[PDB]
Design a protein around this motif. Structure first.
Motif, short mmCIF file in Angstrom:
data_model
loop_
_atom_site.label_atom_id
_atom_site.label_comp_id
_atom_site.label_asym_id
_atom_site.label_seq_id
_atom_site.Cartn_x
_atom_site.Cartn_y
_atom_site.Cartn_z
N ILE B 7 -33.11 23.33 20.45
CA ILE B 7 -33.21 24.20 19.24
C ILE B 7 -32.89 25.90 20.28
N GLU B 503 -50.53 31.38 13.81
CA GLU B 503 -49.79 30.42 14.71
C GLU B 503 -50.88 30.38 16.57
N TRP B 507 -51.88 24.28 12.94
CA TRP B 507 -52.27 23.56 12.05
C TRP B 507 -53.74 23.25 11.94
N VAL C 221 -60.07 19.57 13.04
CA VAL C 221 -58.77 19.39 14.45
C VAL C 221 -57.87 19.91 13.97
N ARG C 222 -57.58 20.46 15.03
CA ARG C 222 -56.45 21.44 15.14
C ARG C 222 -54.88 20.97 15.89
N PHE C 223 -53.61 20.86 15.35
CA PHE C 223 -52.78 20.52 15.89
C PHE C 223 -51.98 21.45 16.42
N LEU C 224 -52.20 21.65 17.78
CA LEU C 224 -50.97 22.22 18.39
C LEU C 224 -50.71 22.16 18.83
N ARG C 228 -43.64 28.42 18.19
CA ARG C 228 -44.42 28.98 16.77
C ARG C 228 -45.92 28.67 16.68
N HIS C 229 -45.69 27.19 16.18
CA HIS C 229 -46.28 26.46 15.51
C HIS C 229 -47.54 26.58 15.91
N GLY C 230 -47.96 26.88 17.25
CA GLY C 230 -49.88 26.30 18.33
C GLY C 230 -48.72 26.98 19.62
N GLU C 231 -49.79 26.97 20.78
CA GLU C 231 -49.86 27.31 21.91
C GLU C 231 -51.29 26.25 22.56
N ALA C 241 -40.50 17.88 26.53
CA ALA C 241 -40.89 19.35 25.29
C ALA C 241 -41.24 19.97 24.21
N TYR C 244 -42.54 20.59 18.23
CA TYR C 244 -42.36 22.26 16.92
C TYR C 244 -41.11 22.00 17.70
N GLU C 245 -40.08 21.11 18.74
CA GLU C 245 -38.37 21.80 18.98
C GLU C 245 -37.55 20.39 18.40
N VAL C 247 -37.80 19.75 14.82
CA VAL C 247 -37.09 20.47 13.44
C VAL C 247 -36.57 20.70 13.23
N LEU C 253 -40.98 22.90 8.91
CA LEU C 253 -42.37 22.10 9.87
C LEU C 253 -43.64 22.38 9.15
N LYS C 254 -44.25 20.64 8.58
CA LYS C 254 -45.19 21.03 8.14
C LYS C 254 -46.63 19.68 8.13
N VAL C 255 -48.01 19.77 7.49
CA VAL C 255 -48.70 18.76 8.18
C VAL C 255 -48.64 18.21 6.41
#
Lengths: 176, 578, 290
Positions: B7, B503, B507, C221-224, C228-231, C241, C244-245, C247, C253-255
């Motif tokens: 990307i 961010e 999620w 729980v949380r998806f990192l 953009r979505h997480g760190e 990689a 998120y790359e 998508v 990108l949605k869960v």
């Protein structure tokens, strides 16, 4: 009015000679079980009245005179199949068997195997041709007699499966 | 060059977002090279060589592609909700227009056949605008996306009627009845067939207000909502996706299994034959077969014939006879686990699902490598080194399993094959033979014993753990993998909400409410089903009811020790949930 | 059922043979009825028969249908369908990281289920393969999923204890980061920045993979996923990689639920038929030879 296909125009390949090898042997084997079933016992004396015959002895060890004219129907059959022009391809298994090249007789039933639609139709039309050949023969004895007719002289399709049965079973056994 | 899609453009990692299909390509780049090629070809034609266009393609694929091999999923109400008399109404909302069928079906409707193809169901197909019962006849119109079709059944005069968006659909003639006359039989239940990429909604009318066209049609006529007076919602059943192993029916149109009792000189045999081979409608797909009971390996692995060796041994043996005239290359023999649900028309030993867990130390050395697979089988074609078939004995593949070591080796024609499988402790291995029928007689299950190997019935049945005589008790039977089974949609699902908090936080997945179900575990099959699913399996329901009766009887009249023992089998949470 | 004197004649060998009938022949309800009649006749209970039937049938747990309560287990997956094939432009090394905000150990009598890892799809269809849509099955229970619950490595309902620094079940404020190598089949786990001495090798790579977590009640729980979505809490391993790359550009990108059916009103429930296989997700150039 039948017309058998021309056979003198074509020649036998040694690869098909290899096939008639062990095929004439298996045919002799099944006919040997037929002989033992209807009463023949292996005996060198030609006591054909008392159910004694030396033919229950392996085909290769049999005399070449007996081997000849016995393979002759196979020769006419292979002339008939090749006269159709059909292509034949050898598999890797069938070539490894060629490379590899006192005993209880082994005959394998092969009605267990089944052909496809295409081989079915091919066998049916080549059986048509064999019935036509037999009808031609019966026609020559008909003109030799000078009269009469035979109930099965009618075409092969006009016949029914019961009298067709021997010609069919011969067709699928050779092609199988 | 080694470049891959990325990307973000990165030369060092060979990242390029342009590595996408032309439709997914960037608009600017696609229009740039697009106008470049427009200009090039337009100059080519202006050069004077006005090449004619090729044959314009007017063909249509008709979207034959589908998930796996399933063309439609059948959704129906529970069998117990069948209606014998009355006059009922329900609605079907078509979210997406396409190949869908909605109608009324009998409890005997199979989940794999087309809805309305046979007599079991009466359905309306709107995509073709054609009715369906033992055939198809033109009826009604075609719906669009969002159109709601209502289904009306009258069990008094044996009439059924369908309405699309309110108007009553009519036959080729002026008759308004979809089907003139039928018999009550065993009753009717609502059903819908959904095609590939088809979305629909069924409203059983628990709330009369939800029904949108009921007021204009159905209410004054006297039809009642299906869920007119139900306190709880209808349990809806769908077609199962994963194929399962079930006993071969006696009336199966293709497969036939015969049990050959073993004489003093012959081992007991289970023989599988193809009924309709050499005839019409024969099935050439690879048919998967399995024996009902498994061989269980030891909990912990160790680290003429002698009767003492045959008492102390744990190796069990069964074999298969590939019938002369059946191609060995189309037959596989070996063991499978309970997890084997892979139904593929073309089966090869290469695509058997497997994983290799290699636990290591902190230093990095591999302590142990464990290969895990659902299928441990071998091919008869590659094993048949002599070739062709022998009338005196067909290709006789023999399988030996060492329950103490987990070693799966295969014996064939007296010579050990090179292939060998090592399984995990406590693994339950089911004898299985996969074969494509090329003959009326395909294969048979030989249950004999080779030298110094304990027969299979000993490992199968604990009662015969010490009986060297081979046995084939009626419990053991051949099972074939099939898609003909229903599945029970849970009444309540776990409540989970998903949302990206930020961010930085990513999620979030959150589930805080507890939900439980009771599972009925079949011991021999290593399976487990919800106990509420037994509303359609009468045999299991009856057997479990009588098991409960026996549980009551053994502790009856104050047998306190037996009650304490039974507290382990049936506990407080299980009781309180039931 | 008729003669009380029969009960005294019945002995331990006969009461074993009756059970052996059930064992050898199969599930038959009238054998159970006979066993019930053995326990109590004419309102009189036989302690010996009741004890023998119990001690000869119940402990085996091989004939009668066992029953148990199992917690419902659901699975969430991202939109990404990452896979490997020849002549296809997708990176073979991938990395994603999980953050456990809170997890109650025992919401019910049974311990809570929390497994994280990767799962595969049979063929190129978007349906997860080899696993039931609903039930008590999660990641690592079927042979198409590969999970890690904190103490064990799960694949095909088989768990092997994996050695890790400070071994424990996944609890509050535990960070799990997963690595998948499709060039050579490799699934690696990384707990709280320490390396998990566990390894998945030589698994089938024909189908499309995707991250997945299987949870039960009391899981937050949380998806990192990175970018953009997480760190990521910890730096990705070199050449890995972020997930998120993968998508697609126009796709967001949605869960979602791993399965297509979820909790909602029965009349609002969207019934989904078979879906088209997502072969278009994998991109392979097909130029015609000239």
């Amino acid at each position: 009015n039948p017309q058998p296909v021309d056979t003198s125009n074509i020649t036998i390949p040694e690869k098909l000679e290899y096939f008639i090898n062990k095929y004439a042997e298996h045919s002799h084997d099944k006919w040997s079980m037929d002989k033992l079933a209807n009463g023949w016992i292996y005996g060198e004396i030609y006591s054909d009245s008392s159910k004694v015959q030396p033919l229950m002895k392996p085909y290769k060890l049999l005399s070449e005179k007996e081997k000849e004219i016995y393979r002759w129907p196979i020769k006419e059959s292979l002339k008939t199949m090749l006269a159709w022009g059909w292509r034949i391809e050898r598999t890797r298994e069938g070539d490894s068997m060629a490379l590899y090249n006192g005993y209880s007789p082994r005959a394998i039933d092969m009605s267990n195997v089944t052909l496809s639609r295409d081989l079915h139709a091919m066998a049916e039309m080549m059986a048509e041709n064999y019935h036509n050949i037999w009808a031609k023969k019966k026609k020559m004895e008909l003109e030799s007699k000078g009269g009469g007719n035979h109930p099965l002289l009618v075409p092969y399709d006009t016949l029914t499966a019961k009298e067709k049965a021997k010609d069919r079973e011969k067709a699928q056994d050779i092609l199988k | 060059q080694g470049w891959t899609y990325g990307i973000q453009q990165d030369v060092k990692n060979r990242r390029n977002p342009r590595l996408v299909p032309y439709t997914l390509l960037d608009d600017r780049t696609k229009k740039s090279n697009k106008d470049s090629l427009r200009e090039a070809v337009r100059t080519l034609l202006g050069y004077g060589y006005n090449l004619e266009a090729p044959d314009q393609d007017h063909a249509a694929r008709a979207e034959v592609c589908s998930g796996t091999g399933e063309r439609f999923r059948i959704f129906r109400a529970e069998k117990t909700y069948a209606v014998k008399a009355g006059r009922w109404y329900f609605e079907f909302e078509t979210v997406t227009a396409g190949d869908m069928r909605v109608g009324w079906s009998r409890p005997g409707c199979q989940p794999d056949q087309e809805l309305g193809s046979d007599e079991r169901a009466f359905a309306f197909d709107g995509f073709k605008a054609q009715r369906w019962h033992q055939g198809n006849e033109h009826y009604g119109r075609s719906w669009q996306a969002g159109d709601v079709v209502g289904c009306m059944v009258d069990m008094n005069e044996h009439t059924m009627m369908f309405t699309l968006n309110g108007e009553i659909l009519l036959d080729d003639s002026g008759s308004e009845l979809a089907f003139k006359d039928f018999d009550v039989g065993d009753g009717f239940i609502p059903v819908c067939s959904l095609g590939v990429a088809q979305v629909g909604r069924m409203n059983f009318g628990k709330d009369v207000s939800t029904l949108k066209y009921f007021t204009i049609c159905g209410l004054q006529e006297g039809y009642e909502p299906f869920a007119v007076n139900t306190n709880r919602d209808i349990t809806m059943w769908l077609s199962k996706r994963l194929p399962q192993f079930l006993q071969v029916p006696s009336n199966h149109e293709h497969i036939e299994v015969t049990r050959i009792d073993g004489t003093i000189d012959s081992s007991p045999c289970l023989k599988v034959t193809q009924k309709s081979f050499g005839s019409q409608n024969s099935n050439t797909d690879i048919m998967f077969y399995r024996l009902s009971m498994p061989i269980e390996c030891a909990e912990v692995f160790s680290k003429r014939d002698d009767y003492d060796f045959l008492m102390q041994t744990s190796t069990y043996y069964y074999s298969v006879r590939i019938f002369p005239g059946q191609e060995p290359a189309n037959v596989w023999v070996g063991w499978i686990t309970s997890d084997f649900h892979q139904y593929d028309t073309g089966f090869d030993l290469d695509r058997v699902r497997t994983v290799t867990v290699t636990l290591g130390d902190e230093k990095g050395k591999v302590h142990e490598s464990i290969k895990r697979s659902n299928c441990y089988m071998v091919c008869a074609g590659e094993s048949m080194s002599p070739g062709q078939g022998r009338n005196n004995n067909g290709l006789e593949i023999g399988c030996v399993v060492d329950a103490a070591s987990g070693l799966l080796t295969f014996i064939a024609n007296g010579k050990e094959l090179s292939t060998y499988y090592q399984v995990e402790p406590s693994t339950k291995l089911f004898p299985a033979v996969f074969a494509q029928a090329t003959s009326p007689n395909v294969f048979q299950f030989e249950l004999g014993r080779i030298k110094n190997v304990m027969p299979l019935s000993a490992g199968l049945f604990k009662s015969e753990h010490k009986n060297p005589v081979p046995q084939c008790p009626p419990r053991l039977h051949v099972q074939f993998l099939s898609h003909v089974l229903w599945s029970r949609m849970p009444n309540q699902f776990l409540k989970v909400d998903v949302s990206r908090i930020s961010e930085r936080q990513g999620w979030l997945v959150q589930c805080l409410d507890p939900l439980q179900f009771m599972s009925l575990h079949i011991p021999e099959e290593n399976r487990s089903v919800d106990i509420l699913e037994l509303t359609e399996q009468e045999e299991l329901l009856k057997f479990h009811y009588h098991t409960l009766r026996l549980y009551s009887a053994v502790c009856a009249l104050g047998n306190h020790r037996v009650a304490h023992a039974l507290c382990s089998h049936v506990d407080e949470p299980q009781l309180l949930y039931a | 059922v008729e003669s009380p004197e029969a009960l005294n004649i019945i002995k331990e060998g006969h009461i074993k043979s009756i059970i052996s009938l059930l064992d050898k022949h199969g599930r038959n309800h009238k054998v159970l009825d006979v066993l019930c009649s053995l326990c109590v006749c004419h309102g009189v209970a036989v302690r010996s028969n009741q004890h023998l039937i119990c001690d000869n049938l119940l402990p085996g747990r091989d004939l009668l249908l066992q029953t148990r309560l199992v917690n419902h287990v659901s699975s969430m997956r991202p939109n990404i369908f990452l896979g490997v094939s020849e002549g296809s432009a997708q990176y073979k090394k991938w990395y994603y990281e999980l953050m456990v905000d809170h997890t109650e150990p025992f919401v019910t009598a049974e311990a809570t289920h929390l497994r994280v890892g990767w799962a595969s799809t049979e063929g190129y269809s978007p349906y997860p393969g080899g696993g039931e849509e609903w039930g008590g099955n999660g990641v690592g229970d079927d042979l198409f999923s590969y999970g890690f619950d904190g103490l064990h490595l799960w694949s095909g309902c088989i768990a092997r204890t994996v050695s890790s620094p400070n071994q424990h079940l996944l609890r509050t404020d535990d960070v799990i980061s997963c690595c998948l190598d499709l060039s050579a089949p490799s699934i690696s786990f990384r707990i709280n920045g320490q390396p998990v001495q566990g390894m998945f090798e030589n698994f089938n790579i024909d189908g499309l993979f995707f991250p997945v977590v299987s949870f039960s009640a009391g899981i937050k729980v949380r998806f990192l996923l990175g970018g953009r979505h997480g760190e990521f809490k910890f730096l990705p391993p070199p050449g890995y990689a972020p997930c998120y790359e993968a998508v697609l550009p126009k796709e967001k990108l949605k869960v979602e639920h791993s399965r297509e059916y979820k909790q909602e009103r029965t009349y609002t429930r969207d019934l989904l038929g078979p879906t088209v296989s997502l072969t278009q997700a994998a991109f392979t150039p097909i130029p015609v030879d000239t």
